[PDB]
Amino acid sequence: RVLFGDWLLGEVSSGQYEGLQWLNEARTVFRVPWKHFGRRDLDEEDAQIFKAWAVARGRWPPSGVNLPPPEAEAAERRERRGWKTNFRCALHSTGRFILRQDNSGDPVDPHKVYELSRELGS
Ligand code: NA
């Protein structure tokens, strides 16, 4: 058990997720991909970070499911909107993260930029 915010910072610093990166050396500001789907389904690429959180919460096996390729995709596909919803709510509930800029409008690279709260005491 770790909090989402600490979990997420570990993923950011990993540099393993495209679009999920630190924006300064000081590591006080980072960006998080933030696509607007609406009606549209999430493909696998759209859901990489959301899926990581679900696996973290034991809501999805780390290896995925042992189904055939088409049925494997569709099984995940049908989970991805809830995963996206669960992640974003968790991020909102992480008061440590202060939204600084909202670039989710840009379709070639929609993301949101957060800063670490300058009043973390204990
Ligand atoms: Na937040």
From Swiss-Prot:
Residue numbers carrying N6-acetyllysine: K84
Family note: Belongs to the IRF family.
Coiled coil regions in record: none
Designated name of the protein: Interferon regulatory factor 7
Recorded name of the encoding gene: Irf7
DNA-binding region: 1-118
Transmembrane segments: none
Parent sequence residues shown: 9 to 130 of 457
Post-translational modification: Acetylation inhibits its DNA-binding ability and activity.
Subcellular location: Nucleus; Cytoplasm
Task of the protein: Key transcriptional regulator of type I interferon (IFN)-dependent immune responses and plays a critical role in the innate immune response against DNA and RNA viruses. Regulates the transcription of type I IFN genes (IFN-alpha and IFN-beta) and IFN-stimulated genes (ISG) by binding to an interferon-stimulated response element (ISRE) in their promoters. Can efficiently activate both the IFN-beta (IFNB) and the IFN-alpha (IFNA) genes and mediate their induction via both the virus-activated, MyD88-independent pathway and the TLR-activated, MyD88-dependent pathway.
Induction field: Induced by lipopolysaccharide (LPS). Induced by type I interferon (IFN) and viruses (HIV-1 and SeV viruses).
Organism: Mus musculus (Mouse)
Record text on subunit structure and interactions: Monomer. Homodimer; phosphorylation-induced. Heterodimer with IRF3. Interacts with TICAM1 and TICAM2. Interacts with MYD88 and TRAF6. Interacts with NMI; the interaction is direct and leads to the inhibition of IRF7-mediated type I IFN production. Interacts with GBP4; preventing interaction between TRAF6 and IRF7, resulting in impaired TRAF6-mediated IRF7 ubiquitination. Interacts with TARBP2; this interaction prevents IRF7 phosphorylation and activation.
